[PDB]
Design an enzyme around this catalytic site. Structure first.
Site, PDB file in Angstrom:
ATOM      1  N   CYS A   1       0.732  -1.269   0.005  1.00  0.00           N
ATOM      2  CA  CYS A   1      -0.243  -0.149  -0.129  1.00  0.00           C
ATOM      3  C   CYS A   1       0.961   1.120   0.176  1.00  0.00           C
ATOM      4  O   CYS A   1       0.592   2.217  -0.633  1.00  0.00           O
ATOM      5  CB  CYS A   1      -0.928   0.142   1.266  1.00  0.00           C
ATOM      6  SG  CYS A   1      -0.329   0.164   2.925  1.00  0.00           S
TER       7      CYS A   1
ATOM      8  N   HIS B   1      -2.860   0.899   6.841  1.00  0.00           N
ATOM      9  CA  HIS B   1      -3.030   0.933   5.714  1.00  0.00           C
ATOM     10  C   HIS B   1      -3.004   2.680   5.201  1.00  0.00           C
ATOM     11  O   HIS B   1      -3.460   3.389   5.915  1.00  0.00           O
ATOM     12  CB  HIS B   1      -4.340   0.380   5.144  1.00  0.00           C
ATOM     13  CG  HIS B   1      -4.823   0.846   3.737  1.00  0.00           C
ATOM     14  ND1 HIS B   1      -4.066   0.456   2.698  1.00  0.00           N
ATOM     15  CD2 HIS B   1      -5.764   1.463   2.949  1.00  0.00           C
ATOM     16  CE1 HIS B   1      -4.580   0.740   1.546  1.00  0.00           C
ATOM     17  NE2 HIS B   1      -5.768   1.373   1.843  1.00  0.00           N
TER      18      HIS B   1
ATOM     19  N   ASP C   1      -6.992   5.921  -3.518  1.00  0.00           N
ATOM     20  CA  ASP C   1      -6.423   4.750  -3.052  1.00  0.00           C
ATOM     21  C   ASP C   1      -6.122   3.718  -3.945  1.00  0.00           C
ATOM     22  O   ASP C   1      -7.010   3.001  -4.709  1.00  0.00           O
ATOM     23  CB  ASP C   1      -7.006   4.117  -1.977  1.00  0.00           C
ATOM     24  CG  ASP C   1      -6.548   2.878  -1.080  1.00  0.00           C
ATOM     25  OD1 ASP C   1      -5.451   2.290  -1.565  1.00  0.00           O
ATOM     26  OD2 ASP C   1      -7.210   2.391  -0.264  1.00  0.00           O
TER      27      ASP C   1
END
Length: 270
Positions: free
Chosen positions: A69, A107, A122
């Site tokens: 991520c 995250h 994202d």
């Protein structure tokens, strides 16, 4: 160094207009996760994950690899900043696949301020990658090139949810506290190195495509067709796993011998 925007846009195959429009944001948000896979190859092989701009560009943009991520969204943020967007980092606690407690803010995602409205973006969530930016508008159901998503309020924070199997399923929860690269470096250290982190012990990979998503966890490959069935297959050998990663999913494994060796050692396959 500076950010090489041309090289990044080449990596993701984007040849559209270069400006800070919603159209551009949408195009980039779709193209990036199709071109750059989500993977945890380095953490699995015990190799350090570097988050500085030089290392991200060299690994991902020049070296043609993917990442997890922080790698995805740091790179994406650099690119958006280069294009003139107003963008900031956020963090989230993952809810997808967890058990109902409070999980670490493990995250990364992004906030984008565009034409007087707040969006999130994202391109780095492993469980289900988002393929369009979303208005931060609680309750509102938002179409994307794949599943519908919505953001809901919960207490003084938000949850991102996706419509899956006729249910609204929570991906993660977040607030709007700004995050910086240094903040991500701490979390990255934990996820990439802690003995408690599953990113060390499993093979996890994903890549979006126009009409489908590929997801791999250990020896289980899932191909999710848009508005269709999900094909499930079990991968029989470490060699087949490597072949699936490198072929189907477009993942580069720097040291295949060590990869396969670890897959066999840890019993990921039979």
């Amino acid at each position: 160094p500076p950010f090489d925007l041309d090289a990044y846009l080449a990596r993701i195959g984007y040849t559209g207009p270069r400006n800070a429009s919603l159209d551009t944001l949408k195009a980039l948000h779709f193209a990036h996760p199709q071109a750059i896979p989500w993977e945890n190859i380095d953490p699995f092989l015990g190799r350090p994950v570097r988050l500085d701009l030089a290392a991200l560009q060299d690994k991902i943009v020049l070296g043609g690899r993917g990442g997890y991520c922080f790698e995805h969204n740091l790179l994406f943020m650099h690119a958006l900043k280069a294009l003139g967007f107003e963008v900031g980092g956020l963090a989230a606690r993952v809810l997808w696949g967890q058990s109902e407690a409070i999980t670490a803010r493990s995250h990364m995602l992004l906030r984008v301020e565009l034409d007087g409205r707040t969006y999130i973006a994202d391109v780095g969530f492993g469980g289900l990658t988002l393929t369009a930016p979303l208005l931060l508008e609680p309750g509102r159901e938002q179409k994307t090139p794949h599943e519908p998503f919505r953001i809901v309020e919960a207490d003084d924070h938000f949850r991102l949810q996706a419509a899956i199997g006729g249910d609204w399923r929570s991906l993660y929860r977040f607030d709007l506290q700004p995050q910086y690269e240094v903040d991500y470096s701490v979390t990255n250290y934990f996820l990439s190195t802690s003995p408690t982190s599953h990113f060390l012990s499993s093979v996890i990979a994903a890549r979006a495509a126009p009409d489908r998503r590929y997801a791999l966890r250990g020896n289980r490959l899932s191909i999710h067709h848009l508005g269709g069935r999900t094909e499930q297959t079990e991968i029989a050998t470490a060699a087949d796993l490597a072949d699936t990663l490198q072929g189907l999913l477009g993942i580069i494994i720097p040291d295949r011998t060590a990869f396969e060796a670890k897959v066999r050692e840890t019993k990921i396959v039979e």
